[PDB]
Amino acid sequence: SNAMSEYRTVSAAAMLGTYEDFLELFEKGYEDKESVLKSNILYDVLRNNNDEARYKISMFLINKGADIKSRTKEGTTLFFPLFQGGGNDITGTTELCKIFLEKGADITALYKPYKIVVFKNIFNYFVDENEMIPLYKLIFSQSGLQLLIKDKWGLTALEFVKRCQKPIALKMMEDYIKKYNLKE
Amino acid sequence: NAMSEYRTVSAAAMLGTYEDFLELFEKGYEDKESVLKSNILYDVLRNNNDEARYKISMFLINKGADIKSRTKEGTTLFFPLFQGGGNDITGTTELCKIFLEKGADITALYKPYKIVVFKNIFNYFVDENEMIPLYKLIFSQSGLQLLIKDKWGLTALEFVKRCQKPIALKMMEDYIKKYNLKE
Numbered sequence: 001s002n003a004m005s006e007y008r009t010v011s012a013a014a015m016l017g018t019y020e021d022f023l024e025l026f027e028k029g030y031e032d033k034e035s036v037l038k039s040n041i042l043y044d045v046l047r048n049n050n051d052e053a054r055y056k057i058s059m060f061l062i063n064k065g066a067d068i069k070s071r072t073k074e075g076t077t078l079f080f081p082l083f084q085g086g087g088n089d090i091t092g093t094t095e096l097c098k099i100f101l102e103k104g105a106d107i108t109a110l111y112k113p114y115k116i117v118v119f120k121n122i123f124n125y126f127v128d129e130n131e132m133i134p135l136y137k138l139i140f141s142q143s144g145l146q147l148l149i150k151d152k153w154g155l156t157a158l159e160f161v162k163r164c165q166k167p168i169a170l171k172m173m174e175d176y177i178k179k180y181n182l183k184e
Numbered sequence: 185n186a187m188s189e190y191r192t193v194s195a196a197a198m199l200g201t202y203e204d205f206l207e208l209f210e211k212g213y214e215d216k217e218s219v220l221k222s223n224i225l226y227d228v229l230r231n232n233n234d235e236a237r238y239k240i241s242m243f244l245i246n247k248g249a250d251i252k253s254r255t256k257e258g259t260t261l262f263f264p265l266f267q268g269g270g271n272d273i274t275g276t277t278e279l280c281k282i283f284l285e286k287g288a289d290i291t292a293l294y295k296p297y298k299i300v301v302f303k304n305i306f307n308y309f310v311d312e313n314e315m316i317p318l319y320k321l322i323f324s325q326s327g328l329q330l331l332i333k334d335k336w337g338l339t340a341l342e343f344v345k346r347c348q349k350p351i352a353l354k355m356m357e358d359y360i361k362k363y364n365l366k367e
Contacts, residue, residue: 008191012199047232113271114309124307124347126336153311164347 004028010036015044019056037061040070046081051089058096068103079118080111087125094135101138108144117146117157129168136169140176147173148184156184187212193219198227202239225249229264229279234272241279251286262301263294270308277318284321291327299334306344312351323355330356331367339367 003021007013013025026033042061048054062068071077078100086093101107111118119139125132139145147157158177161170176182186207190196196208205228209219225244231237245251253261261283269276284290294301302322305315312319322328330340341360344352359365 005191008195009189012195015199116309120309121307126338126346151309155311160347 001028011039011041011044014041014057014061015047017048018050018053019060022053022057023060033064037064037066040067040072042066042068042078043070043072043076043081046078046085049085051092054085055089055092055096062099062103068100068105075109075112077106077109077118079105079107083119083121087121087127090125090127090131090135094138097135097138101142107139107142108146110146110149113152115149115151120157120160123161123164123166123169129166132168136172140172143180145176147177148182194222194224194227197224197240198230200231201233201236202243205236205240205243220244220247220249223250223253223255225251226253226255226259226261226264229261230268232268234275237268238272238275238279245282245286251283251288257295258292259294260289260292260301262288262290262292266302266304270304270310273308273310273314273318276305277321280318280321284325290322290325291329293329293332297335298332300329300332300340303334303340303343306349306352307347312349316351319352319355323359326363328359330360331365 001024003013003017003024007017007021007025007029010022010025010029010031013022013029017025026036042058045054045057045061048057068078079097082093082096082100086096097107107118109118110116111120122132122135129136145157150156158173161173186196186200186204190200190204190208193205193208193212193214196205200208208214209216225241228237228240228244231240251261262280265276265279265283269279280290290301292301293299294303305318308315328340333339334343338346341353341356344356
């Protein structure tokens with residue numbers, strides 16, 4: 001039993017192992033499946049550096065009814081680890097964002113420790129913006145984005161995007177601000 | 185009962201609290217000397233709990249962990265330090281300082297991506313003012329490889345130009361000029 005020896009909990013398997021490793025733990029581990037599903041296990045999954053594992057395990061848990069609306073003790077939604085780690089699989093990250101939104105997760109909440117929009121990292125992605133459009137559409141279709149709120153150091157989300165090389169994101173943010181009539 | 189969570193000190197060091205780690209180390213089954221001789225410090229630097237990362241790292245450093253350790257791919261302790269260090273800039277800076285003082289090599293790339301080992305710090309959300317001490321530690325070292333194309337085709341210099349970190353960029357340009365570095 002490779003995975004059963006390597007991982008003591010489903011949480012560990014979810015963050016470090018393959019989809020197959022995670023399955024071994026979910027089924028054969030000592031923890032109660034129902035307790036696992038009600039936990040913030042998806043937060044651990046999203047931190048898996050393995051894109052294929054991250055996606056397959058995420059979809060498995062979501063389909064089994066894992067908690068989508070959970071928050072860390074600091075108030076952080078699933079969107080944060082999704083966007084922090086999702087740069088190498090835009091198709092997968094987009095799909096997961098779509099599903100989180102459909103299932104009621106809140107993308108408007110800030111990441112409190114730094115007072116930043118939860119998707120700030122997507123503007124760091126090394127992928128052509130043409131590829132980012134589906135994800136951009138998902139995000140800007142949500143009411144309540146906090147684009148003009150100063151972060152812990154006095155920088156708003158708009159100000160940040162202005163200084164990246166992301167003209168499409170910039171245009172869409174300006175459009176969002178004009179649509180909703182947002183002010184500084 | 186940390187052993188219900190972690191079977192090894194390694195697992196505790198990476199996933200658990202300092203207290204969990206201490207229970208595995210002291211009251212676990214593995215031999216302390218074998219653990220101290222392992223590259224467990226590398227695993228600690230991956231711990232998402234910054235309080236635990238700091239406390240456990242200092243514990244191992246003080247007991248003589250090998251600061252010059254290398255993974256099979258030739259990776260130094262600086263890689264997990266910087267990859268995971270953006271939520272605690274103070275502790276990240278302190279650990280970098282200690283690693284340099286104890287002789288770790290900050291010039292080695294992360295070979296699989298051909299990136300400089302501190303590449304991720306330029307993605308940190310903190311204001312550059314808070315990063316000056318770390319920058320000063322890094323740019324005072326001989327032999328930084330700032331003009332090597334990573335697997336995405338970006339040198340360290342080109343990367344810092346993307347989402348602007350103006351202080352890092354100036355300091356890089358200064359460093360390139362100082363050591364007359366070329367592509």
